Amino acid sequence: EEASGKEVEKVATAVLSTTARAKARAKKTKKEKGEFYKNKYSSKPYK
Amino acid sequence: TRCKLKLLRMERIKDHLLLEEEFVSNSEILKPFEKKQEEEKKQLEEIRGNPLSIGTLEEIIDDDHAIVTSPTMPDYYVSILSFVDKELLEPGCSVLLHHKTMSIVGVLQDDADPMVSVMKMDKSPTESYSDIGGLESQIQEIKESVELPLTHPELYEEMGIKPPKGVILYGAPGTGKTLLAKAVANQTSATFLRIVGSELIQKYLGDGPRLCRQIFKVAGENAPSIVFIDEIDAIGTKRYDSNSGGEREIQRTMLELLNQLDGFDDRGDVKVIMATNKIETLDPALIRPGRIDRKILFENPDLSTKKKILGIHTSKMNLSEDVNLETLVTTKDDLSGADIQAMCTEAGLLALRERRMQVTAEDFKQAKERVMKNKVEENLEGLYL
Amino acid sequence: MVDESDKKQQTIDEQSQISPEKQTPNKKDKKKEEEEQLSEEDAKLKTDLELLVERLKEDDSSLYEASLNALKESIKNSTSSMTAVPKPLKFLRPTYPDLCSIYDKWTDPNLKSSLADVLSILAMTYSENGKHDSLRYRLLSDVSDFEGWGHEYIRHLALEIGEVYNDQVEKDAEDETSSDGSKSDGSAATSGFEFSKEDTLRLCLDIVPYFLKHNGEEDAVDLLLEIESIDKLPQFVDENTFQRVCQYMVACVPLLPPPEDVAFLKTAYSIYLSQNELTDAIALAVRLGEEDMIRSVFDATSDPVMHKQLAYILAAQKTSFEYEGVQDIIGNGKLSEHFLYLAKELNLTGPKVPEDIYKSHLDNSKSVFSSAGLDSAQQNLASSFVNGFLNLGYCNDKLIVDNDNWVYKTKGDGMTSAVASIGSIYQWNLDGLQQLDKYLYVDEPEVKAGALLGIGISASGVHDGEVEPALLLLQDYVTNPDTKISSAAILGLGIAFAGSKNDEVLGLLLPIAASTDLPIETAAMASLALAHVFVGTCNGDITTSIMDNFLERTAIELKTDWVRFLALALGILYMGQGEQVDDVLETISAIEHPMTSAIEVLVGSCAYTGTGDVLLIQDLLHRLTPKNVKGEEDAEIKSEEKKGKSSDKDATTDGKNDDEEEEKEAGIVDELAYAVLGIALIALGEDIGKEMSLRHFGHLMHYGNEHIRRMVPLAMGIVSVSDPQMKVFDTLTRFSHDADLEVSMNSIFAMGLCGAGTNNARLAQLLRQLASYYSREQDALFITRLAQGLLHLGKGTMTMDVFNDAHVLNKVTLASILTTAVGLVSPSFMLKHHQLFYMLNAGIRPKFILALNDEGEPIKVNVRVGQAVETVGQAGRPKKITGWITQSTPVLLNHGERAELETDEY
Ligand SMILES: Nc1ncnc2c1ncn2[C@@H]1O[C@H](COP(=O)(O)OP(=O)(O)NP(=O)(O)O)[C@@H](O)[C@H]1O
Ligand SMILES: [Mg+2]
């Protein structure tokens, strides 16, 4: 992704994570209330 | 009971909500700077930079120049450069200077100093009225002079007489003078500044009058107002070093208070209350008699006064209810309410020696005899002839 | 201890010195090991009951912990004894508290969780018998306090509550909800609940409204209705018991859904009706708005004695005080039916007498001549504004008013306002009609209109007297072809008739007179005026207004201002109901525009009132939503956006206002604390958002009716000099009125200093001068609180035109409207039969910080203040009635009520 693609991605999550909890919580509650590193390459053929 | 709970439930939906709103609103989509800030910011940095020397503003000359003093000893004929307008500045304020070239780059400090901290009190005092028991009449003299003109000047106008201004509280330790002042002020719900006199006098030269002038400015803005200057008696005619000095700096601070008392603005709507031993401790000079008007001589508690004051104290000592309020009064020798404070302390002191597990009727009675005995012992028999 | 020999009665004596520990092996080992031994336990039962109480007075933890170790099964839980049926039912009684000692005397979270199930099954089963009723009572009422019972009774009663709590915490409830493992219903349980309510009335205060609310049922209130009528007299004196009841009801309000909220009130009303004081009953009857309820309180007063006596005098007067006037109907009705004196009682129900007492107060206070007469440029306009507000209420100003010079030298919309503000000299007073009519019959169309606005305001206290009615005059003037004469004419129609719903008036104002097709803001006043007429009773939630709102808004939307006026009109109409306000919301939302979405946020704040648990969150989700989308993008078509925003801003502040005022006094402090931090959020998020919120913020104060009218407004106002807008000051001041020349000594001092300070605008100076002048009022002049007074929880009928005008940026046009500010509090006077408009004494408490008293009843020592004391705002507002000195007792209780006092003098 390199540095550019990362920076957008990261800020992008952060907005949505805060924004979900900031509204989802208040509505919902009252809705209701009322390895083989060493593993070489498998000996199987591959194309 | 129930009502308290209600307030807690409301807080737990208010603060939780608030925290989250802030994050989303200030930044994210909306943006915290939203372009305009970014512009101001770039300019501000240029003009500035660290370090920045805090200053004191002596006078403004309308011509975009000012006369400032810094930490360093010589003064500076400096230019005002942008930011704070001349109007929005007040002389006597602490101001922001840029260090390389000293120009007024703003203000944010506003007499950032512990003195300011101690003086300001925007709410009314902790003492509500005639919780204090006895000297009723006395406290209903301080109310005639202070309180009554702020609440209604109408009555004074109609008589054809200036409202009284000022009271001077004087007399004797033990009568809870200081307390009466707080009491009267609370009823008024006057903005009740309060200060210790010891702070206004210091060794360093010329800081004293700055501070003193400021008290008077803050009070007039927030009129109707009471200024309570506690321990005016401190300053007195104490003179640090009797070789020389104490006849320079000390004298200058006293002067300033008086020059502003009547002032260049009419502050008849600023009452003053001076708590003091006597005015003869000070070099007498309290200007305008009718401007300090009625003076209040505290008598010490008498027989009826100390009943009420007693009643508070005995409720703290466990099981002293057994001994009738009246008969406690009778059996002891006539003494001041202060000496009740000494007596009440004596009861607990004896309970501690005994390892009296719970305070009893027997302790409170024993307490009288030892307390009375202390006072007689301390007295010196010179023999009435 | 637990030994086999200690099942013997030789061991009573040896154990008992330290503490009986005999009882453990006798009801554990003997019982479990055989069912043939159950018959033998029966005789030994009575010794065991005696010993149980001694072990609570000799309570210690080691001899319950150490001994019991297998009780749990033996009782019923697993052994499942019941071979002799009757035998184990009686042996429930000692074992149930012993078990509770391993719940509590032994501390262990784990043991607490496990035994929750076991204790509740054992309590329930035996509460049907009412021999378990006998266990609780004997401990609660014993004279001598002890360690053992003192915590254990508390664990027993949490279970009761628990059971009804099961319906709320989970949807599953009953025995599925395994907090208690026991269903809340059943004859056995219903028998146990009912009993306990009697005990905790005497001893507790805060668990009575928790049980009611948690059940969720009006069935809980039906059980309480009956027990409370029995306990009113013997437990405590009536007056004291009534005061406790009233606190409990307001508590139930937050966290009850809208259809149910009102229904709890009707069951409550039944308790009150039975209890003696019919003073308390009427408050709820007004609140509901129901004709049935309002009727039953009256009928109850008048009829029980056929002699006129105090009863009839009382009945008429309680309805009389209220300036809505819907209440006047009931009295007029009873009076036409009766004929003790048709002349006297009909006036006394009528709103003629509230005018009459204002004339009387005036003589005491002396008439104030202070009114401005200034001319030239802007000061010409400023003088017209000051005239009205400074002399608000009935207050002779004959001399300045006779001066026609200043009136006629005014020009523009200002010329109309000059005559409108003379009307406000004679506010709520018959007298001063003559002056307005002088103007009306001469010169410019301007002062003609203005005369009409003035008539409207004066005739207000004749909302239901129908003496020289406005309706007769003002109709002819609608028909006049010029737009200015017409508009004025119909707004007077509104103000004159108040909330009193008169068919001839309602139908006069029912079509907007002028063509809807026209975009004019002179026919805005049709919707504004009609709204007022609707408030103060069950709203019809009329369909005509809704339908026509949509049509005019689509057809012409150029004047952004025009259509805002229409949206606020709906919001005002709906005040005092949220049941039917929900239904109409769907109609609004069905159709869509950003213009429609503006109306939507605003009516929702009104909707969700009757519970602040729901309301507040709604109008803070909302607050974000407009901002956020626009932010996203930024990172005549115009009108649509603008509206969207401006309403959103207003609705934020409104939902708080509707909560704190209607509901609990506790929230008054929570919303005040929340408000200031909420300005700051909005300031960071938008520069533009700040300015709109600031105005509504000073209105937060007046509408909510904060406790403190001294310190906190003054502090606020200093900050709001620096900020843009000074229309914030005008709303702020109506709260600031207080006991003048304390608050209002500061006010004049602040405004004039800052105008001097920086003349940033002449416009700014203007709003600064008018607001400080309005603040001060002389010789205890009548004041206006938005609160009904009588109903401290209440909301105004006609002080919601300030709400209309806060929203829209002030204009020269709008300043005429503001003269209207009718909702003046009446001076209190002692009565009985004399109907003397004077009082010996009345006590006040100078401070207010009470919120335990939702009543706002003060300590009765008080501080005595003379005759003709206008019922001052908050920090003075709680009022007790002085006359015991003369041997008189209030029969009409005051609790900072607006009401004129009445005693039965011995
Ligand atoms: N009417 C009164 N008001 C207040 N305190 C009183 C009164 N009468 C007697 N007292 C007693 O005086 C005590 C407090 O007095 P205190 O604060 O020592 O004095 P002061 O007169 O302000 N002196 P200083 O110690 O020089 O500042 C109270 O705790 C009472 O025991
Ligand atoms: Mg002192």
Swiss-Prot record, chain A:
<feature type="modified residue" description="Phosphothreonine">
    <location>
        <position position="13"/>
    </location>
</feature>
<feature type="compositionally biased region" description="Basic residues">
    <location>
        <begin position="22"/>
        <end position="31"/>
    </location>
</feature>
<comment type="function">
    <text>Acts as a regulatory subunit of the 26S proteasome which is involved in the ATP-dependent degradation of ubiquitinated proteins.</text>
</comment>
<comment type="similarity">
    <text>Belongs to the proteasome subunit S1 family.</text>
</comment>
<comment type="subunit">
    <text>Interacts with UBR1.</text>
</comment>
<protein>
    <recommendedName>
        <fullName>26S proteasome regulatory subunit RPN2</fullName>
    </recommendedName>
</protein>
Curated annotation (Swiss-Prot), chain B:
<keyword id="KW-0547">Nucleotide-binding</keyword>
<dbReference type="GO" id="GO:0005524">
    <property type="term" value="F:ATP binding"/>
</dbReference>
<dbReference type="GO" id="GO:0043171">
    <property type="term" value="P:peptide catabolic process"/>
</dbReference>
<dbReference type="InterPro" id="IPR041569">
    <property type="entry name" value="AAA_lid_3"/>
</dbReference>
<dbReference type="GO" id="GO:0000502">
    <property type="term" value="C:proteasome complex"/>
</dbReference>
<dbReference type="Pfam" id="PF00004">
    <property type="entry name" value="AAA"/>
</dbReference>
<dbReference type="InterPro" id="IPR012340">
    <property type="entry name" value="NA-bd_OB-fold"/>
</dbReference>
<keyword id="KW-0539">Nucleus</keyword>
<keyword id="KW-0832">Ubl conjugation</keyword>
<dbReference type="GO" id="GO:0006511">
    <property type="term" value="P:ubiquitin-dependent protein catabolic process"/>
</dbReference>
<dbReference type="GO" id="GO:0045732">
    <property type="term" value="P:positive regulation of protein catabolic process"/>
</dbReference>
<dbReference type="InterPro" id="IPR027417">
    <property type="entry name" value="P-loop_NTPase"/>
</dbReference>
<comment type="similarity">
    <text>Belongs to the AAA ATPase family.</text>
</comment>
<keyword id="KW-0963">Cytoplasm</keyword>
<dbReference type="InterPro" id="IPR032501">
    <property type="entry name" value="Prot_ATP_ID_OB_2nd"/>
</dbReference>
Swiss-Prot record, chain C:
<dbReference type="Pfam" id="PF18051">
    <property type="entry name" value="RPN1_C"/>
</dbReference>
<feature type="modified residue" description="Phosphoserine">
    <location>
        <position position="16"/>
    </location>
</feature>
<feature type="modified residue" description="Phosphoserine">
    <location>
        <position position="187"/>
    </location>
</feature>
<protein>
    <recommendedName>
        <fullName>26S proteasome regulatory subunit RPN1</fullName>
    </recommendedName>
</protein>
<keyword id="KW-0597">Phosphoprotein</keyword>
<dbReference type="GO" id="GO:0043161">
    <property type="term" value="P:proteasome-mediated ubiquitin-dependent protein catabolic process"/>
</dbReference>
<feature type="repeat" description="PC 6">
    <location>
        <begin position="714"/>
        <end position="745"/>
    </location>
</feature>
<comment type="similarity">
    <text>Belongs to the proteasome subunit S2 family.</text>
</comment>
<keyword id="KW-0647">Proteasome</keyword>
<dbReference type="InterPro" id="IPR016024">
    <property type="entry name" value="ARM-type_fold"/>
</dbReference>
<dbReference type="InterPro" id="IPR040892">
    <property type="entry name" value="RPN1_N"/>
</dbReference>
<dbReference type="GO" id="GO:0034515">
    <property type="term" value="C:proteasome storage granule"/>
</dbReference>
<feature type="repeat" description="PC 5">
    <location>
        <begin position="566"/>
        <end position="598"/>
    </location>
</feature>
<feature type="repeat" description="PC 2">
    <location>
        <begin position="450"/>
        <end position="487"/>
    </location>
</feature>
<dbReference type="Pfam" id="PF01851">
    <property type="entry name" value="PC_rep"/>
</dbReference>
